[PDB]
Design an enzyme around this catalytic site. Structure first.
Site, short mmCIF file in Angstrom:
data_model
loop_
_atom_site.label_atom_id
_atom_site.label_comp_id
_atom_site.label_asym_id
_atom_site.label_seq_id
_atom_site.Cartn_x
_atom_site.Cartn_y
_atom_site.Cartn_z
N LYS E 157 0.83 -1.20 0.00
CA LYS E 157 0.00 0.00 0.00
C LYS E 157 0.86 1.25 0.00
CE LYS E 157 -2.30 -0.85 3.81
NZ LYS E 157 -1.54 -2.07 4.18
N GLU E 183 0.32 5.90 11.04
CA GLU E 183 1.30 5.26 10.11
C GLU E 183 2.68 5.24 10.77
OE1 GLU E 183 0.13 3.91 7.51
OE2 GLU E 183 1.89 3.34 6.32
N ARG E 184 3.60 4.43 10.25
CA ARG E 184 4.95 4.43 10.79
C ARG E 184 5.60 5.79 10.63
NH1 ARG E 184 4.11 1.15 7.09
NH2 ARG E 184 3.64 -1.07 7.39
N1 LIG Z 1 7.06 -2.00 -6.89
C1 LIG Z 1 7.57 -2.83 -5.96
N2 LIG Z 1 8.65 -3.59 -6.22
C2 LIG Z 1 9.18 -4.43 -5.31
N3 LIG Z 1 8.67 -4.56 -4.07
C3 LIG Z 1 7.58 -3.86 -3.68
C4 LIG Z 1 6.97 -2.92 -4.62
N4 LIG Z 1 5.93 -2.37 -3.98
C5 LIG Z 1 5.89 -2.89 -2.73
N5 LIG Z 1 6.88 -3.77 -2.55
C6 LIG Z 1 7.12 -4.54 -1.30
O1 LIG Z 1 6.19 -4.14 -0.30
C7 LIG Z 1 6.84 -3.92 0.95
C8 LIG Z 1 6.36 -2.63 1.58
O2 LIG Z 1 4.95 -2.64 1.71
P1 LIG Z 1 4.24 -1.32 2.30
O3 LIG Z 1 4.00 -0.37 1.16
O4 LIG Z 1 5.04 -0.89 3.51
O5 LIG Z 1 2.84 -1.90 2.81
P2 LIG Z 1 2.24 -1.50 4.24
O6 LIG Z 1 2.33 0.01 4.27
O7 LIG Z 1 0.83 -2.04 4.21
O8 LIG Z 1 3.15 -2.19 5.23
C9 LIG Z 1 8.34 -3.87 0.68
O9 LIG Z 1 9.04 -4.77 1.54
C10 LIG Z 1 8.51 -4.27 -0.76
O10 LIG Z 1 9.29 -5.46 -0.87
#
Ligand SMILES: Nc1ncnc2c1ncn2[C@@H]1O[C@H](COP(=O)(O)OP(=O)(O)O)[C@@H](O)[C@H]1O
Ligand SMILES: Nc1ncnc2c1ncn2[C@@H]1O[C@H](COP(=O)(O)OP(=O)(O)OP(=O)(O)O)[C@@H](O)[C@H]1O
Ligand SMILES: Nc1ncnc2c1ncn2[C@@H]1O[C@H](COP(=O)(O)OP(=O)(O)O)[C@@H](O)[C@H]1O
Ligand SMILES: [Mg+2]
Ligand SMILES: [Mg+2]
Lengths: 498, 50, 466, 69, 468
Positions: E157, E183-184
């Site tokens: 996300k 959020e973090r």
């Molecule tokens: N375009 C992308 N390419 C590679 N990995 C991705 C990509 N988009 C998300 N990720 C993966 O998603 C993870 C991060 O998710 P995140 O956006 O933090 O979700 P949330 O905020 O719900 O935790 C990362 O560890 C990464 O490996």
């Protein structure tokens, strides 16, 4: 003419619920006023639901942030009521009836009360006249008759609102006064609905009663009962539409699940004992009160009718939840919309295998009754024969014949949005399909075949459309005058095209 | 039809406007009426009337 | 015997009475409104000092916190007699048809009565002549025993009950009581009145020979809960007179739902999945008054709406605990226009034994089931194999089974609206004779669609030769 | 019967306040009157005793606007 | 004014006030707290005897009963105007960046305002190009329309939101507002500051055109419960004067969760899974202010966290009806390293209509959903029996469906650290052309491994040719 009015003091106001202390001789569903004070130039009404001892907890129809402890309330003797009549046609109103489209005050002379007992026991009549939805699937397999309660149940996004709006649009010259009640729906979504209805000119016979998400749970709670009152008055007294006295009304409850959630909120804030899924005890009673008012009065009581189309969203297609089962039990029919069918190209996305219309043939024209039995039977046989179609390759041309014909009919039901088909159109198409005149057409081209045949029928032969429409009510629809000049048109189209 | 509907809507808007303005100016009238000759026992008589 | 209303929370009313004049547990309360109309509330709990908690059985949108309450002393009294015959009532026994009110000379009886004692039970069990071939053959209908029509929606439960009433009123001389527990106004009011005012005897109408009590779905939960007991009182009057009576209860599932709603509104702790704690006993109070006494018998035919295919749901489970015969309706059968859409298999009865119905009845009814179980395993083979003829004698068995399956359908007199066919009544002796002749081999050399909607095998032969 | 209240646009009625206090003994007995101004209120008729009120100064005008609209 | 604390239940403080000076429902009352800094509580419920219940919106773990409470007499007012641009604010509107406080001359507005009326709603809608293939094809974003990205914990996300900001926050034609609720504080902010100050539109960074309110997870429930409204108050001023606003709210689910915690402390009866009875009302009060009106437009782009992978949870369930374009992120797709992870079948949009987005776009998207459906229907058949028992056309559609699944993968400029491939900006027209070509039969000979983390179809063809 000064007169004594009983009053009480607000002692505790919370999340839209106010405790009113001394309001002796107050009736159990009054409107309590909260008259204007400094910092508030209007009056915020409220419904006195809980009549407890030494305390009346009343839900507030508006923002409670202006209501303060120690404020005064006057117990107006009137029960909740809404303005009703001819003036509401084409007006967006809140459940209290105050217009919100900003087109001016509602002109009215009568105010029916919401929360009315059902029309009667012996005052109704067997549902006979059809409600032409304009969708082949509904009009042929799950027919809706005037005065029938037909639930539109489905997942979060499958086409429930689309089906209801198409139903509303198709009642152009059918002498129906549709009503669209938006309950807990976001304001821009009701604006989209109103724009769609205005674009097709359907807002000259439609009343929109919107209680959106931000509006207090009290307003959403009375949202369907208002509008239902308008439909009741339309079926009992009638309104003048296109110069003809229309005594038929169609009411759409955008989302009864949101109505049930609003009632759950106002019940839990009143500290009423919970029930299953934290809903109050009398939620089935709420929805049955709402939906039993939709009836088809006999000729002694006017002959009018009120058709209800409740809408419910199910979480992950969990039909067995509390409110979905309540309204499934209440209603006289169900229209199940599924996301699996919606994504698979079945654009109406109806699940004909489980959708039911207990009125059945009685809510159809005699042409539709004479034409749709073979359709329903063949579709049922095809649904029984599922796996064989899709990867069994060792079938005769007896199973495979049913597979082919069922695929033909299923592709026939695939219909776009905002393109309703009148009754004669569906009769002609289903006659072509069920009399083997469509067998040679390949599967993917059937939607285009139907569209082309309709275009040919508008232009090349309008006389056959008029002929079908004139004698759609006779007991034996395929009259030789009709069988001729319809089979002839089908043959002409088959030879001319492809 | 829509032109006539908007015409009657404009008529209703004008009727609401004039009806509201009648009271909004009567507010000034009654306020000034009570401002100068506000020494009337009629008020107290109405309070005691019940 | 006059108190005051203390609290009004929804359809639950808390009223305070004098300390020595508290109403009994199930007494009526009868809140009086202005124009002589009243609001009968049933007490449910005596609590505290003179305070009674009662269920409304009405709107409660017109009541204050000081209205007087007129305790009746007895439970909800309902008219019973010849005068209650041919009329339509609500839960309180007041007539809801257009005719006049019931006169005071008619006896009134309390809605709550004890069921017959264990001694009075009549263990002699004999088949009740139905008229429907599939019901008479596969799931015979006991006299004084409970039967339930199970199924989902568009299955034919209400229409089957309607046909049962019409047939047993016409061909037998049988009275009937209809309990519209949670009754749809469209269905119950003007499709039962209309199609029983059309079903006609000689100078007499089926509507005139039946009682109808409609606790409609718009009424509060208490009315839907106690309408069944109202209908039971109506039928019990005639049973006490010695007449065999045929009670009908529509969607006892809605009776269970009304009980759950009442319990939730009364503050009782939820049981199982939110249902009432007093579920089994509430069902027993209703289902145990339906039994075969020495003097008379109340025969019952209940409809049960199963959500989806969940037979573990509490209402079907409790009914099954209280049943004698089971009739299962299937949507798949109905969609093929086999409109009396009973499933031969999964439709059981305890009367279907050689001793009661007879040796020939048991034999001819057990053959069909086997024959059909064989077809369920061969319909599908003939589908996959693309080869009907690859069967030594299973091709004959399949043909006979298909003829049988088409034969169970029957034109109902109350279904003349749907199909426009006259209603055919088939006695049980004719049913067993017809199916025995079909299994013998006479059913051969007649193509399908001649068994579709016919009463007897004689009717099939007459259609064939013509 | 108790906890009276009399609000009017023009406050400081002097003896009249005391006259109201002594004449409000008509029903039952002692009352505790509290007076307010509320400038938006054009004319003062609000008297509250117990759980009843009487006011037809803004409310005659309110009935008028209901009539016209 | 001048009340006293009666009870301290969590972050719900019960305070008694004089009978004639009770606070209103949403006034902001203050505990002096000593040391010259105050604790601003927001009233929620007026109890009996001048007793009110207020939500602490702060630490509230070192204050005793009987402490003085001062009633400000007005709700929580936050600064609005151009003075808020390029600044970072608390839930209370107090800046938390190093710059100085907002001067008194800057207008202060309450955070509890009525949403726009029905008459003010703006129905006009057109496609908003994002550069992401799956989002631009299956669920096209609307300019001035609400959209939300639903997903579990590990699914992408926040990376989707960050790539979206890096893509569209340079050509704003207006300002933007960011709201990372619950959020973090690591990635949610102070890593987005780096990129928003690194991006330079024209002599001015993207940060210079951004208002930013955090109320990160570390904060107690009240801050997370009112930070969304603070951010909406910041954005509404710019909407009302005609500026086009980009609104990014993070994990609206933490708004709902903070509401649930506050409601539990408030003594309300829990609804469904421990959630507040006033779930729908709070959700509507937050979301009906996120609307493009006639005066100006807000292009909201939210994120939503589903408890674990539950999509029937009440919070996302209430969110789904408050959107124009829905996006669903699946754990299973992310575990397959198809990291954009959008489920085409569970993702929809209102403007996926041939009149708005174009006839060819609509046809391609609907075909890409039909094909995707066929594969979901045949999933078990493939799972146990195998691929060979399917018909020839079913087999072809399954292979094309797998190629489509792999092809929705797209490298992002912000995700370059995870996948070494550079980011690819694929315009919507190229996405439509690529998927039309893929469905037409072109690329059937190519192995599915070459559709992974590519741009348009031309990049796939180039990779295949380089592989020969
Ligand atoms: N375009 C992308 N390419 C590679 N990995 C991705 C990509 N988009 C998300 N990720 C993966 O998603 C993870 C991060 O998710 P995140 O956006 O933090 O979700 P949330 O905020 O719900 O935790 C990362 O560890 C990464 O490996
Ligand atoms: N033939 C069709 N019938 C219905 N919807 C269609 C059709 N073709 C496309 N659609 C699109 O499918 C979606 C149908 O959802 P719709 O707006 O009718 O509400 P819904 O499915 O009841 O759910 P909700 O209102 O909760 O989002 C809309 O995007 C509509 O544009
Ligand atoms: N002969 C028949 N017997 C039973 N049902 C029939 C018959 N012919 C048609 N039907 C269908 O049964 C419907 C009535 O269903 P009904 O039994 O009233 O409700 P339920 O679905 O609860 O069984 C009719 O409207 C029609 O669709
Ligand atoms: Mg909708
Ligand atoms: Mg029924």
């Amino acid at each position: 003419q000064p007169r004594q009015v009983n009053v009480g003091t607000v002692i505790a106001v919370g999340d839209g619920v106010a405790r009113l202390s001394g309001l002796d001789q107050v009736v159990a569903s009054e409107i309590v006023e909260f008259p204007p004070k400094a910092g508030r130039n209007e009056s915020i009404y409220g419904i006195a639901l809980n009549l407890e001892q030494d305390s009346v907890a009343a839900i507030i129809l508006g923002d409670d942030e202006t209501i303060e402890e120690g404020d005064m309330v006057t117990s107006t003797g009137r029960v909740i009521s809404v303005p009703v009549g001819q003036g509401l046609l084409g007006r967006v109103v809140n459940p209290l009836g105050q217009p919100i489209d900003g087109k001016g005050p509602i002109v009215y002379e009568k105010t029916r009360p919401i929360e009315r007992i059902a029309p009667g026991v012996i005052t109704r009549k067997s549902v006979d006249t059809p409600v032409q939805t304009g969708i082949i699937a509904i009009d042929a397999l799950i027919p809706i008759g005037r005065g029938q309660r037909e639930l539109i149940i489905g997942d979060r996004q499958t086409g429930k609102t689309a089906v209801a709006i198409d139903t509303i649009l198709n009642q152009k010259g059918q002498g129906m006064v549709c009503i669209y009640v938006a309950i807990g729906q976001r304001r821009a979504q009701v604006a989209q609905v109103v724009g769609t209805l205005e674009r097709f000119g359907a807002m000259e016979y439609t009343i929109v009663v919107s209680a959106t998400a931000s509006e207090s749970a009290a307003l959403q709670y009375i949202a369907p009962y208002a509008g239902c009152a308008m439909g009741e008055e339309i079926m009992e007294n009638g309104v003048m539409l296109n110069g003809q006295l229309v005594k038929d009304a169609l009411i759409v409850y955008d989302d009864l699940s949101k109505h049930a959630v609003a009632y759950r909120q106002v019940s839990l804030l009143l500290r009423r004992p919970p029930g299953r899924e934290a809903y109050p005890g009398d939620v089935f009673y709420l929805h049955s009160r709402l939906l039993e008012r939709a009836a088809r009065l006999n000729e002694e009581y006017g002959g009018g009718s009120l058709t209800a189309l409740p809408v419910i969203e199910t979480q992950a297609n969990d039909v067995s939840a509390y409110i979905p089962t309540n309204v499934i039990s209440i209603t006289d029919g169900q229209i199940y919309l599924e996301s699996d069918l919606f994504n698979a190209g079945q654009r109406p996305a109806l699940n004909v295998g489980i959708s039911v219309s207990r009125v059945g043939g009685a809510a159809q024209t005699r042409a539709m009754r004479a034409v749709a039995g073979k359709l329903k039977g063949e579709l049922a046989q095809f649904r029984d024969l599922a796996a064989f179609a899709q990867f069994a390759s060792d079938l005769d041309a007896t199973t495979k014949a049913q597979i082919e014909r069922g695929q033909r009919l299923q592709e026939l039901l695939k219909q776009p949005q905002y393109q309703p088909l009148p009754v004669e159109d569906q009769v002609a198409v289903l006659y072509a399909a069920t009399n083997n005149y469509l067998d040679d057409v390949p599967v993917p081209l059937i939607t285009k075949w139907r569209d082309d045949f309709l275009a040919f029928l508008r232009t090349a032969h309008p006389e056959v459309r008029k002929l079908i429409y004139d004698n759609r009510l006779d007991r034996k629809f395929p009259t030789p005058e009709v069988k001729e000049a319809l089979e002839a048109a089908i043959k002409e189209f088959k030879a001319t095209s492809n | 039809a829509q032109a006539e509907q908007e015409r009657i809507r404009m008529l209703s808007e004008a009727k609401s406007q004039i009806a509201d303005l009648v009271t909004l100016t009567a507010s000034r009238v009654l306020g000034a009426e009570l401002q100068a000759r506000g020494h009337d026992a009629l008020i107290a008589e109405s309070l005691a009337a019940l | 015997a006059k108190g005051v209303i203390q609290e009004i929370i929804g359809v639950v009313i808390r009223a305070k009475f004098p300390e020595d004049e508290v109403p009994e547990i199930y007494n009526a309360i009868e809140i009086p409104l202005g124009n002589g109309d009243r609001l009968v509330c049933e007490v449910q709990q005596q609590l505290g000092n003179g305070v009674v908690k009662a269920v409304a059985m009405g709107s409660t949108d017109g009541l204050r916190r000081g209205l007087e309450v007129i305790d009746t002393g007895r439970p909800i009294a309902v008219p019973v007699g010849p005068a209650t015959l041919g009329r339509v009532f609500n839960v309180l026994g007041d007539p809801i048809d257009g005719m006049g009110p019931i006169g005071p000379e008619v006896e009134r009886r309390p809605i709550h009565r004890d069921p017959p004692s264990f001694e009075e039970q009549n263990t002699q069990a004999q088949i009740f002549e139905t008229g429907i071939k599939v019901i008479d053959l596969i799931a015979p209908f006991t006299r004084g025993g409970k039967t339930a029509i199970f199924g989902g929606a568009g299955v034919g439960k209400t229409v089957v009950i309607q046909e049962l009433i019409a047939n047993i009123a016409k061909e037998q001389s049988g009275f009937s009581v209809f309990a519209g527990v949670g009754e749809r106004s469209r269905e119950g009011n003007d499709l039962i009145h209309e199609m029983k005012e059309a079903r006609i005897d000689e100078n007499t109408t089926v509507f005139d020979k039946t009682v109808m009590v409609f606790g409609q779905m718009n009424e509060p939960p208490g009315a839907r809960l106690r309408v069944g007991l109202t209908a039971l009182t109506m039928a019990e009057y005639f049973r006490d007179e010695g007449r065999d009576i045929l009670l009908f209860i529509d969607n006892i599932f809605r009776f269970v739902q009304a009980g759950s709603e009442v319990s939730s509104l009364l503050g009782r702790m939820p049981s199982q999945v939110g249902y009432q704690p007093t579920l089994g006993t509430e069902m027993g109070e209703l289902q145990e008054r339906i039994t075969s006494t020495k003097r008379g018998s109340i025969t019952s035919m209940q409809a049960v709406y199963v959500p989806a295919d969940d037979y573990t749901d509490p209402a079907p489970a409790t009914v099954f605990s209280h049943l004698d015969a089971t009739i299962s309706l299937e949507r798949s059968i109905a969609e093929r226009a086999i409109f009396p859409a009973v499933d031969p298999l999964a439709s059981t009865s305890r009367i279907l034994d050689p001793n009661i119905v007879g040796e020939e009845h048991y034999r001819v009814a057990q053959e069909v089931k086997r024959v059909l179980q064989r077809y369920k395993d061969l319909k599908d083979i003939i589908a996959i194999l693309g080869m009907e003829e690859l069967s030594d004698e299973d091709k004959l068995t399949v043909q006979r089974a298909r003829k049988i399956e088409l034969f169970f359908s029957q034109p109902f007199t109350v279904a003349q609206q749907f199909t426009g066919r006259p209603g055919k009544y088939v006695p049980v002796k004719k049913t067993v004779e017809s199916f025995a002749r079909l299994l013998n081999g006479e059913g051969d050399h007649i193509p399908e669609s001649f068994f579709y909607m016919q009463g007897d095998f004689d009717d099939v032969l007459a259609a064939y030769e013509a | 019967a108790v906890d009276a209240s009399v609000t009017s646009a023009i406050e400081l009625s002097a003896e009249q306040k005391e006259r109201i206090t002594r004449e409000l003994q008509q029903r039952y007995g002692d009352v505790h009157v509290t007076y307010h101004v509320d400038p938006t209120l054009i004319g003062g008729l609000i008297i509250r005793v117990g759980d009843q009120v009487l006011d037809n100064s803004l409310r005659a005008r309110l009935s008028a606007i209901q009539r016209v609209l």
